[PDB]
Design a protein around this ligand. Sequence first.
Ligand code: HEM
Ligand code: HEM
Ligand SMILES: C[C@H](O)[C@H](O)C1=Nc2c(nc(N)[nH]c2=O)NC1
Ligand SMILES: C[C@H](O)[C@H](O)C1=Nc2c(nc(N)[nH]c2=O)NC1
Ligand SMILES: N=C(NO)NCCC[C@H](N)C(=O)O
Ligand SMILES: N=C(NO)NCCC[C@H](N)C(=O)O
Lengths: 362, 362
Amino acid sequence: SHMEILWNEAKAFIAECYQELGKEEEVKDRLDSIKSEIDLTGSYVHTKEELEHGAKMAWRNSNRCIGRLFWNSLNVIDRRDVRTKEDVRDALFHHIETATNNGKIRPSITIFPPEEKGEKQVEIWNHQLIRYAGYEAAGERIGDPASCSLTAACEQLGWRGERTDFDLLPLIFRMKGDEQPVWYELPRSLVIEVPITHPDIEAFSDLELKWYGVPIISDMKLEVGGIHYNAAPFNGWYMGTEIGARNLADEKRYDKLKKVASVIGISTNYNTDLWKDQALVELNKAVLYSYKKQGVSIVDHHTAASQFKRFEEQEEEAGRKLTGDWTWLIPPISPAATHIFHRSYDNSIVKPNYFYQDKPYE
Amino acid sequence: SHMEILWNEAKAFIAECYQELGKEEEVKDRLDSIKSEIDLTGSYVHTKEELEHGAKMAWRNSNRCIGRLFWNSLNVIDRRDVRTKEDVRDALFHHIETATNNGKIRPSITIFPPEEKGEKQVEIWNHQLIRYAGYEAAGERIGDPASCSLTAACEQLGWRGERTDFDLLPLIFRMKGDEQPVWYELPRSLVIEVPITHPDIEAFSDLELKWYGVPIISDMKLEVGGIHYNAAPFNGWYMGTEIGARNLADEKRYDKLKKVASVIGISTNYNTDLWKDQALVELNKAVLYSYKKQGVSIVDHHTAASQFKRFEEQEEEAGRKLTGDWTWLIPPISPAATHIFHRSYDNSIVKPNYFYQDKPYE
Ligand code: HEM
Ligand code: HEM
Ligand SMILES: C[C@H](O)[C@H](O)C1=Nc2c(nc(N)[nH]c2=O)NC1
Ligand SMILES: C[C@H](O)[C@H](O)C1=Nc2c(nc(N)[nH]c2=O)NC1
Ligand SMILES: N=C(NO)NCCC[C@H](N)C(=O)O
Ligand SMILES: N=C(NO)NCCC[C@H](N)C(=O)O
């Protein structure tokens, strides 16, 4: 039944892809080759043009992403030639270096070899290539609680952290033919970090906060024409609220709102004073100012929504339908001040797209 | 087919209602009487206990309401005896007076006669009993844009406003047997209004803002045991954000954020400064402070979410399932700071409940 499903999805992808590219003539021929290949091996190999355009279409169909206006400018890195653990490590080191680009971040994706008979060639365990560790001793919390389970798995393999609130996790992945994964500590020269300060309030630095510069999701599956690429890291640039309103504010994460209120000089006695709302405004203002000072790319939520509006218009103009998830598109601060809040979206799934997959650990 | 549907809904309501009331014995008898009544007239008459408990259950099932913790304390006013236009006017005047209660607002509902053969006995045109008019001359906007259509209909009947930003609309309703509705100007002694000032910034009064004290939704249909009460006004008390983050902030309503930014001393040049988020915080703080000073009931969003949490727990403890609409339950300011944001809800419809109905005007 797997051979049937593969053929269906290949028929729809080739036609739609070559149509957008203006190569409708070649559709008839290529399909005959893919068909013969499927009967011969049980799968097919995408051309460079096909995989490159496929990863772009997948971003365009991501219902939960507010940055879809820049979909056609994605930088695609083809690494389907990797065979060893050293090959993977160097490619991952290269992704961080080129995407960072000394601060002027470049949206990118690295393509590793896909699954064969459902079996993987390379399996990445990290959620993001750069992330902080999390420990929960009987005493209290240290680090990022969302990293608990992955942190425990790394220490079960010989790794050991320093136990500060910001320990960098190591790269951890498994090669086909091995029962357990291998790990490599990240070189400090490759990772940019940004200390958090405030434009007018000098005491803000007493909190000693900081965050990393580039978010690189590395545990999702990219599906193109029936072919499953379980390993394919991708990155864009941060939207301010992700850090100041969630990562540092959530009670289940760093939980910093009370401390913020203290350094800015306001009381935390009464809810009618709305101290939580005021603390959120100063913290978020601090995140945008600090990233800009050091020259690292970032975007505020009002500018972001404005760009997404232009995206909706372009899609209508091109003749394509729009899909999206309202519950993820609205910003976590001042949502009613953007256009997104005042309209509705169709949350249907269209392929090619990016998908969630089960975690090896846990 | 209408006689069939009525019987079904009556069977489920009586059993469920008498069960909660601990009168399961009387279920067998009452059902036999209702059945005979339906064959005789084509409808049935609720007892005082049945209608009172029915309006309470309906509030408990309202997916979009965050104030459901106080459902069992609702004040029910039975006015199914009205026959003339003067009878309706006095009852509506009485609802505003008793619900206001000199500031200590009392959640209430007034029950008018229900529909017969789909035909209404009394039809209310107002959206809320107390609301401001809206005009849109070629010059610009004056008043509340959301009141445009209803305002035009009132002037088509002989009414005339003064054209300020806060003209009070008149009560307007139609009696069975008349082709057009009648109107009555509201007595100023019955309507409480609150001027908006700021606790620390004295220049805030230069904006000359104000809003009314009690929101009374009067155009929804209450359905209990197959019986349709198209006319049944109800009220609770305001949640701060409804006024400061929507009524006075939306670009399609009063659109005041830029003016607010001016009186507090901040610039509106750059989105990275987050001036819209800061203006929203001071305006909302002003609304809570002003209502309290004058002694009128109001609640902030953090306290409100906290109360709703206790509601979820009580429902679980009583053995009933929970239903709700996430998109309406989350507050329009700092949503990620409340528990509601971090969970999911089942948006199924359970009866008895309140429903939308077509507008006579427009
Ligand atoms: C160029 C700048 C980019 C910005 C400004 C941006 C911003 C966002 C934001 C705000 C979210 C929500 C994250 C959260 O709440 O945790 C998101 C989700 C997502 N974005 Fe982007 N993104 C960018 C680039 C990309 C790229 C390059 C891709 C893919 C090639 C992409 C695919 C998606 C997908 C699938 C999600 C959902 C993730 C999940 O379900 O956990 N985005 N993006
Ligand atoms: C006692 C205090 C009350 C508070 C604090 C409260 C608060 C709220 C809020 C914030 C909304 C959203 C309004 C909007 O976004 O426009 C709402 C909606 C609603 N509430 Fe309440 N409410 C109260 C009492 C009541 C009462 C007394 C009833 C019914 C007997 C009720 C029935 C509902 C319903 C059906 C909606 C949806 C209205 C719509 O769809 O337009 N609430 N309530
Ligand atoms: C996770 C669950 O679906 C829940 O709706 C939310 N979390 C998030 C959210 N929105 C964003 N962007 N990110 C989240 O983590 N909204 C909803
Ligand atoms: C009206 C439409 O359903 C849209 O989701 C919204 N308006 C509102 C909303 N939330 C509230 N409480 N009130 C609204 O007017 N969220 C959604
Ligand atoms: N802005 C982007 N992608 O470019 N974001 C991805 C998800 C990141 C996650 N919200 C974090 O704070 O780490
Ligand atoms: N808080 C309550 N009901 O008690 N609200 C009802 C809806 C009111 C509407 N949001 C307004 O601002 O007028």
